[PDB]
Design a protein around this ligand. Structure first.
Ligand SMILES: Cc1cc2nc3c(=O)[nH]c(=O)nc-3n(C[C@H](O)[C@H](O)[C@H](O)COP(=O)(O)OP(=O)(O)OC[C@H]3O[C@@H](n4cnc5c(N)ncnc54)[C@H](O)[C@@H]3O)c2cc1C
Ligand SMILES: Cc1cc2nc3c(=O)[nH]c(=O)nc-3n(C[C@H](O)[C@H](O)[C@H](O)COP(=O)(O)OP(=O)(O)OC[C@H]3O[C@@H](n4cnc5c(N)ncnc54)[C@H](O)[C@@H]3O)c2cc1C
Ligand SMILES: NC(=O)c1ccc[n+]([C@@H]2O[C@H](COP(=O)([O-])OP(=O)(O)OC[C@H]3O[C@@H](n4cnc5c(N)ncnc54)[C@H](OP(=O)(O)O)[C@@H]3O)[C@@H](O)[C@H]2O)c1
Ligand SMILES: NC(=O)c1ccc[n+]([C@@H]2O[C@H](COP(=O)([O-])OP(=O)(O)OC[C@H]3O[C@@H](n4cnc5c(N)ncnc54)[C@H](OP(=O)(O)O)[C@@H]3O)[C@@H](O)[C@H]2O)c1
Lengths: 445, 445
């Protein structure tokens, strides 16, 4: 018989479990699945907590979400393929669900799946080794509930431990003497803290955009964002100037590359994350940049230096839930032997290279979206996963992109066509800038 | 030769290296020494950084110190018996040096000791296992300069990783929703942030004492401190007040056991730390409360379930630097063979029980001080550690305590007798509450 260890109970690990349970429904025998989760409850990033730094058990807080956060993409872009919205909420909702709403939705199908009984919560994995003679992986985990660490052999390890949790926190001259709050996005929690204040937001990507907005919505005196590469470029509110790279701080004085100046009360470092695995030896440890074509993963899921070990979700993410399903099915199939991996490490490296180069062929954002779209499509064709209208996802993604470039601060006040009934979403009872309440029930009436 | 691995290059780990160096200079054979240090530099808690949470490498920030921190005790009670403050600084400085100053003193000693060549920085330990059949420990460490993990065998392991870095962070009702800053002391860095605010300081121990005082010195609008057991009991300033146990928060308003009420702008959790070792298996992982009689440590230093493993600094601390020394010399001598461990585990366990029982014989403060004094005497008598006036050091704490009950806010404007000379240190050039500059240059003029 076989046993498989899944590290993480975020959307990815959860997707993996759904994958095995699905095959077992159909009538397939499956190996024992053990899923280790560090937190007390499933949901990965979506499992919000006020904590920052180390959690109550002393482990580093995984959560990177803050209050007042709504879906960054239209929900129509992420709608599951085996369980849809209305089926869980009963009704049609607006196009940008708040965190709680989406968490409840993520919760919906996982509960319905009866997978929870596979998850060991409060159980950070401490280490994973591979013995070539047994052909077994040895996972080592600490059970916080009983304060005891133990070890166990598995035939496979599927690492679903995320990569938007270990922050890149760069030092700039003046940071250690700045008389104000300096915080990475991983630790940002409540925008009310910056009400009436002058915020500096470093970065030009998703977090800078959304965290900047949050603080604008909740009353910052002003927003200053700064880029080091391409500006976010959107049409910013009155209190929002975008500026070139920081040189240094002197007091509360930000000096920028164009010689200009601004005094700010607070700095939110929206400078991204690293793929970091504290629990992996060199010959298992994935090392890569954040991007659509992840180094060292054949088919974007199988570890080239040891193909009995897998990784989910390690790509940068235009597509999310639907991708992790596509990935999890594939990894499932490879484990059940419906799919046979190459024994030729050269050829697995070839596959990665090809992905990298194709990814690099164009820098246009619609090309990039389309690209991960072709990826999902690739995967879904190679397993019994329900083929679905991905191009329909893409078309939503394209409308999204036109709404943000249109009016960055109102883009969440739009609706998009559904992909299962082509029916364009209703509007929300309330405008985003007015919708100060965050709660699920406020959203749902 | 034998090899010994030292975990940590703070004061205890550094004391341990000095110990081994001193022995070898005198011409005793010594095992090879490898000291693994997480941080970029030595210093342990005294190596300050602005960072909180995870460090530039993704490892948890060890630092628990803040800006404007000064020695909370008389420098007289911690002076290296083999390296006087006079030998280092050349003159005679006041009794409560700022962080930077004592840091330079710690570094001064290991400078002269030429032991830095033994230290591997940016190299946190990942794991320690013992194998009884080879009678060697296996140490897995990760080198962030080469981003490479490796494993090596050692005949002894001396863990000096400290226990004031992994915080105890309780949940109280309303923490999830408080409109303001909630920060544990371990993440606290700059008191200026609290200028003008009604601060809530939870706790009644050293941390709440000092951090509350920093907040007040640097202009907090008001301080409220709450206890769950015994009030701190000091004659506080007029804008400072102690309340019984917090029950909950409602918006910005705190509720205490006495049914009273106060609105607060920020909460600093000075609720302490845990003994936490993310890198040890059940069979080597010290588990103990923070006190003077540490559990499962023979002579306060040798893990009783495997006495080839030792631990430094795990006790609560009145005495600090020279205790670390006594311990370091002891452990050294036990490893060299100048001391023999009891063949009977019952004996080691017996030794720990008598220490607990004697710590518990009385709850009076002077008696605790004397108790730790006796431990240092006990240890010192068994090695060739330089003798030094322990009683005198003890009288320094007795006067220190007196000065604190007399004036909790000025106790640092005081001098004490050198354990070597007997004469009162010079007065510093500025009252503490006015000494806003904490630099080593301002201090030494
Ligand atoms: C701030 C933020 C906002 C986002 N918003 C959106 C959005 O609106 N829409 C969208 O589609 N996508 C969004 N994403 C993308 C997000 O990554 C995915 O939606 C999804 O949460 C990732 O799935 P995952 O399970 O692979 O990663 P994670 O959600 O990070 O799951 C990893 C899980 O593994 C666990 N784990 C980690 N290490 C260990 C260990 N050693 N032992 C045991 N368990 C461990 C963690 O507890 C965690 O629960 C957002 C990401 C971030 C950072
Ligand atoms: C806020 C605060 C203020 C204090 N002020 C004073 C004072 O004024 N006077 C005084 O006498 N005492 C003070 N103390 C007590 C303090 O514990 C000692 O001064 C001293 O720092 C103890 O030294 P140590 O080496 O035992 O522990 P630490 O100083 O904590 O040293 C531990 C070292 O081990 C390293 N380490 C940890 N884990 C790993 C790993 N897995 N791999 C590799 N390396 C690792 C850490 O990076 C760290 O450098 C204070 C303590 C605190 C928390
Ligand atoms: N529904 C979703 O899937 C969803 C969408 C939004 C966010 N996200 C995911 O998470 C990622 C985006 O979140 P993110 O913004 O937090 O990460 P990020 O994409 O890596 O953005 C990092 C930003 O910080 C800048 N930066 C990095 N290091 C810096 C430094 N040392 N100094 C100054 N600036 C620096 C970057 O500039 P440079 O460009 O020059 O590096 C970049 O603008 C996406 O890639 C995405 O997959 C999830
Ligand atoms: N050389 C010196 O100047 C000097 C002298 C005195 C002490 N010390 C040292 O410095 C250390 C103290 O630092 P510290 O104050 O940060 O830690 P600490 O001594 O453990 O103090 C913790 C405080 O928080 C309280 N607390 C703990 N858990 C709580 C919870 N869940 N809810 C509410 N309150 C809670 C404690 O109350 P309870 O007591 O009820 O648990 C205590 O008041 C000691 O370990 C000691 O070594 C130094």
């Amino acid at each position: 018989t076989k046993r498989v260890a899944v590290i993480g109970a975020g959307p990815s690990g959860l997707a993996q479990l759904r994958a095995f349970q699905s095959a077992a429904d159909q009538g397939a025998e499956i190996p024992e699945i053990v899923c280790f989760e560090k937190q007390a409850n499933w949901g990965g990033l979506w499992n919000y907590t006020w904590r920052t730094g180390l959690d109550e058990n002393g482990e580093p807080v995984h959560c990177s979400m803050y209050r007042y956060l709504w879906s960054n993409g239209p929900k129509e872009g992420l709608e599951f393929a085996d369980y849809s919205f209305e089926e869980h909420f009963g009704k049609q909702i607006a196009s940008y669900p708040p965190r709680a709403v989406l968490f409840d939705y993520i919760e919906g199908r996982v509960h319905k799946a009866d997978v929870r009984k596979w998850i060991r919560f409060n159980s950070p994995v401490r280490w994973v080794s591979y013995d070539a003679e047994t052909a077994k992986f040895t996972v080592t985990a600490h059970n916080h509930e009983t304060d005891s660490t133990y070890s166990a052999a598995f035939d496979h390890v599927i690492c679903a431990s995320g990569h938007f949790s270990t922050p890149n926190v760069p030092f700039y001259e003046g940071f250690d003497t700045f008389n104000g709050r300096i915080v990475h996005a991983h630790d940002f929690r409540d925008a009310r803290e910056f009400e009436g204040k002058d915020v500096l937001v470093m970065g030009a990507s998703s977090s800078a955009e959304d965290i900047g907005s949050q603080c604008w919505k909740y009353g910052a005196k002003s927003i200053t964002s700064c880029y080091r590469s391409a500006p976010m470029g959107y049409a910013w509110p009155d209190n929002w100037e975008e500026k070139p790279a920081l040189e240094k701080l002197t007091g509360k004085t930000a000096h920028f590359a164009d010689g200009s100046t601004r005094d700010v009360d607070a700095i939110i470092l929206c400078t991204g994350y690293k793929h970091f695995f504290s629990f992996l030896p060199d010959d298992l440890r994935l090392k890569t940049a954040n991007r659509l074509a992840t180094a060292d993963l054949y088919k974007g899921v199988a570890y080239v230096h040891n193909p009995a070990m897998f990784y989910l979700g390690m790509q940068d993410q235009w597509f999310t839930f639907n991708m992790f399903d596509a990935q999890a099915w594939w990894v499932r199939d490879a484990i059940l032997g419906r799919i046979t991996l190459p024994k030729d490490k050269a050829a697995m490296l070839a596959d990665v290279a090809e992905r990298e180069t194709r990814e690099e062929a164009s820098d246009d954002v619609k090309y990039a979206i389309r690209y991960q779209a072709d990826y999902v499509k690739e995967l879904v064709a190679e397993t019994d996963y329900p083929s679905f209208d991905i191009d329909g996802a893409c078309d939503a993604f394209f409308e999204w992109k036109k709404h943000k470039a249109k009016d960055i601060m109102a883009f969440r006040d739009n609706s998009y066509k559904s992909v299962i009934t082509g029916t364009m979403a209703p509007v929300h009872h309330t405008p985003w800038k007015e919708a100060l309440d965050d709660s699920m029930e406020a959203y749902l009436q």
